[PDB]
Every structure is written in C-alpha cells, then in structure tokens.
Amino acid sequence: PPTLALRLKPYKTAIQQLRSVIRALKENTTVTFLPTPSLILQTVRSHCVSKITFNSSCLYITDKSFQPKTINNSTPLLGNFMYLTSSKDLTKFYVQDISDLSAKISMCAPDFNMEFSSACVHGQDIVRESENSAVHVDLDFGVVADLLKWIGPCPTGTVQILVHAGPPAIKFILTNGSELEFTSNNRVSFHGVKNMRINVQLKNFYQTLLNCAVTKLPCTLRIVTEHDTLLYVASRNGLFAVENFLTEE
Amino acid sequence: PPTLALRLKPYKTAIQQLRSVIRALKENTTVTFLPTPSLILQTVRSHCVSKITFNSSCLYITDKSFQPKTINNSTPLLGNFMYLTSSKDLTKFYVQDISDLSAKISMCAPDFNMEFSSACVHGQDIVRESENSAVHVDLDFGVVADLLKWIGPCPTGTVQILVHAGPPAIKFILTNGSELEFTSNNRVSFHGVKNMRINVQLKNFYQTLLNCAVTKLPCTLRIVTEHDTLLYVASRNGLFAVENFLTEE
C-alpha cells in the first residue's frame, strides 16, 4: 500500500516551531498529503487565507502511486488533528492510500498505536500570482518583531500599509493614529515600489505576522493590484513555508 | 473476539452529565473495563481517591470470556481518553480483548472511525469498608448545592466536619471561621451519629461535592474510624455512581 511517512526528526522540529499556529487552526482547515512529497495546511479566515507547506525533506514516500489526499483538520472525535501530531512522544506518523474516499492515518508512541480513517474532501490549490506592477519589500526578522510588539497591546480596527517611491518607504498606520515606518536598507529591502495603499483588518495582519514569525527569519511582503488589491506575507525555512493572502478591507 | 460495547443512549447521557468530572481527570487516572459488565474510573489526589462506576445498563457484553482491562486515561497522543468519548458525535464505542497485554478501543462518528491499542496496567480495587461505630448522614441535593455555593468563592485551607449526637447535627467549619450546620430531617437524614470530628483539605472536599453534584440527587456522607479516619462522600443514579474517599488532614 502506497505510504507517505513523516521523517520524524525534521517533522517534530517543524511542528514544534509551528505549535502556536497549529493551536489556532479553524473548522475549515484542510490537510493535504501529496506524493511529491508534500504536506499542506490551508485555512480560510475572513479576508485572509493561510497556507503552511512542509518541505519535502520532512517526508518519505515509498511509492509515487499514492493518491493525493485532502482531509479536514477538525476531526469528529479527535478534534485538532495536526495538534495531536505535535505530541513530543510521537514515534511514527504515516498516511496510507487504501481507499479512494478516505485516508488512513497511523501514529505511534512508546507503548501506543492508533489508526484512523478520515473522509477525503475536495481541496483548492492556492497559487501566489505575479503582476508587473507589484510592490515587494523584505523585512528583517527584527522588523517583524517590532511590528508585533507595537501591534500587540487583542487587536482591533485596521492597518493601512502605505508605500512610497519618491524615496522608498513602507509605512504602517493603525486606526488610533499610531504610525511606524521603515526606509532603512540594513533593516528592510525594497524590490519594486510604487505610491499605493492597502487596508487590512488588524487582527488578520497581526495573526499573519505571528505565524510568519515562527521562522525567526526574514518575511516577504508583496502587494498586488489586478484581480483585486491583495497583501501577501510569507516566511520560510528549510522545513516549511508560511504564506498568507490578505484581501483588502 | 470478546467485545465490551457501550450502549450509546445511556452512555452518552451519563458522559454528558459527567463532562466536568471527566475534564478534571489526572495523570494516574485509570479506566477499567470488566465483563460484568462495568466501566470504572479511578483517580488519586492528595488525600483523596475518587471512583466513578458506570451502571451495567450502560454496557453490552457479547462474550463473558472478555478479560478485565485497566488502562491509563492519560493516553500518549490522544491525551484525556474519556473526554474524547464525551464527543456529541460519537456513534459507536467498544473495547476488544485480542491480546493479553493491551486493550483495543474502537470508536466511530458519522464519517470517521478510529482504533487504538493501549497498554494494560495493574489496577487496585477500592472497596467501601463498614464499621460498627460509623457516622452516616444523607444530604438532600439542595444541601449539597448550599455547601457548594458557600464554599465556592479557588478554595484554600481546610474544612472540619463536626458531628454531634446529643441531638443530631452535622456542622462544617472553614479555616476563616465560617460555619454552617444542619439538624433538619426534611433536609438531611441521620443514620447513626456520634460526637466526632474530621478535618480534610477544602479543595478536595469542594471537588468531591462538585463531582457528586452531577447527579442532582442526594449525596451520602459516611465517616469511619478504624484503619484511620476517613470521609466517604457518594451519590448515584441509574447510570453511574460517584464515590470519594478523603483521608484526614
């Protein structure tokens, strides 16, 4: 039977880094297993879609005939499935393709083993789109930390992200009139700017930053204008990538 | 294979009544499955041992060769096992005896099924002991409620239970000097009293009362003096019995 297995050392590391993100997953959150190999978490919040993709280095695949499987993370009795995989006692975690309609998940710990079969759902894949006029600014981890400390007081209202080109700058404005801005090359890196603004809910922007901050590495911000106005915020390491897509308003 | 199955209607009712108790179970809490049929939860806290026994009417047994199984409620990956059984979506729950060293638990929900095998441990059975000189007072549910409201302010210090025989009375005294007492037949029932006292931790007595109060029915208090000084507090309905054993100090 075609088996997709998690490689324990990098997976346990990754899932520990992500523990706070995984604790925050929603009722619609999906988990996708691919023969690539890949594992993808995808979550819809108001005007915000979030995707966590595990690097292939976290997985072992025995047989590429393994059919793609998407399941709900919210599991009838078990609740938050991905949270259970963050158990520090986990010794084995694999998925088997033994029926068309479902995925069979196996997990072990010292003197324990368990299996469950969850119904497959129809997933959507989300692709970061490119546009000729897009803004792209990379933020050092220290900048992300500063934004989080600033915005972290339960966050309400909106944040306006205001970008300038005259000289380059990225500016952040909150509902209460507070403003922070960055111009400085050894703190941020500008890769295409134009005079523009985007307004997003503060709660979503803060959660987005929190999720990206798990890498303790630089985060990429992009803003596009075509299908509509959208803010992309992402970070990654060699174990996983966190990507968020925030729709204006 | 010998199967012990939960009868869904009375089990789901019982487990819903007990939900708060089950949320509070400890690392040493055991779950015992018997061919009687019976299911027993047993938990050790400081000077307090608590036992929940499900009435046979909650169980169906196919084959009395089923070997007795005790397992830890704290389950490596799953965490609080009994809490998972309180899922309002549960459609099937049974235990199979297919190995000497372990119990195989199966559980279902609409489009979900799961199985796990947990290692058997060595349980102790706890028996309420009788003594010729013991105090026994039954308390109406309204009395239990009054005690809970009185003691419920996080409870610290101790409670002294002071019993009198001249005329009969049961008295409760807290560390801060507050005192409540009962003498009244249509509120409490005296079945053997003698002049005596017992002192227990307030936190344990309060938790004990909370657990018994789930029946919304009268609760039995007994106090013994032999092996040592001990307070027994219990309540039951046709679905389960809650029993607690509090050692003096």
From Swiss-Prot, chains A, B:
Compartment annotation: Virion; Host nucleus
Any single GO BP term: symbiont-mediated suppression of host NF-kappaB cascade
GO cellular component, one term: virion component
GO molecular function: DNA binding; DNA polymerase processivity factor activity
Record's keyword annotation contains Iron: no
Top-level taxon of the source organism: Viruses
PTM notes: Phosphorylated by UL97 on serine residues, phosphorylation seems important for UL44 nuclear entry but does not directly affect its role in replication. Sumoylated.
Statement: the UniProt record of this protein carries the keyword DNA-binding: yes
Signal peptide residues on this chain, from the entry's feature table: none
Record keywords, A-Z: DNA replication, DNA-binding, Host nucleus, Host-virus interaction, Inhibition of host innate immune response by virus, Inhibition of host IRF3 by virus, Inhibition of host NF-kappa-B by virus, Inhibition of host RLR pathway by virus, Isopeptide bond, Phosphoprotein, Ubl conjugation, Viral DNA replication, Viral immunoevasion, Virion
Primary localization class, coarse: virion
Function, in words: Accessory subunit of the DNA polymerase that plays an essential role in viral DNA replication and acts by increasing the processivity of polymerization. Forms dimers that binds to double-stranded DNA and UL54 specifically to stimulates long chain DNA synthesis efficiently. Plays an important role in maintaining the structure of viral replication compartments by interacting with host nucleolin/NUC. In addition, suppresses innate immune responses through effects on host IRF3 and NF-kappa-B.
Family assignment from sequence similarity: Belongs to the herpesviridae polymerase accessory protein family.
Domain topic, free-text comment: The C-terminal region is required for viral DNA synthesis.
Known partners and oligomeric status: Forms homodimers. Interacts with host SMARCB1. Interacts with host NCL/nucleolin; this interaction is important for the organization of proteins within viral replication compartments. Interacts with UL112/UL113; this interaction is necessary for efficient viral DNA replication. Interacts with UL84. Interacts with the uracil DNA glycosylase UL114. Interacts with the DNA polymerase catalytic subunit UL54. Interacts with host IRF3. Interacts with host RELA.
Name the UniProt record assigns to this protein: DNA polymerase processivity factor
Phylogenetic placement of the source organism: Viruses, Duplodnaviria, Heunggongvirae, Peploviricota, Herviviricetes
Residues of the full protein shown: 10 to 270 of 433
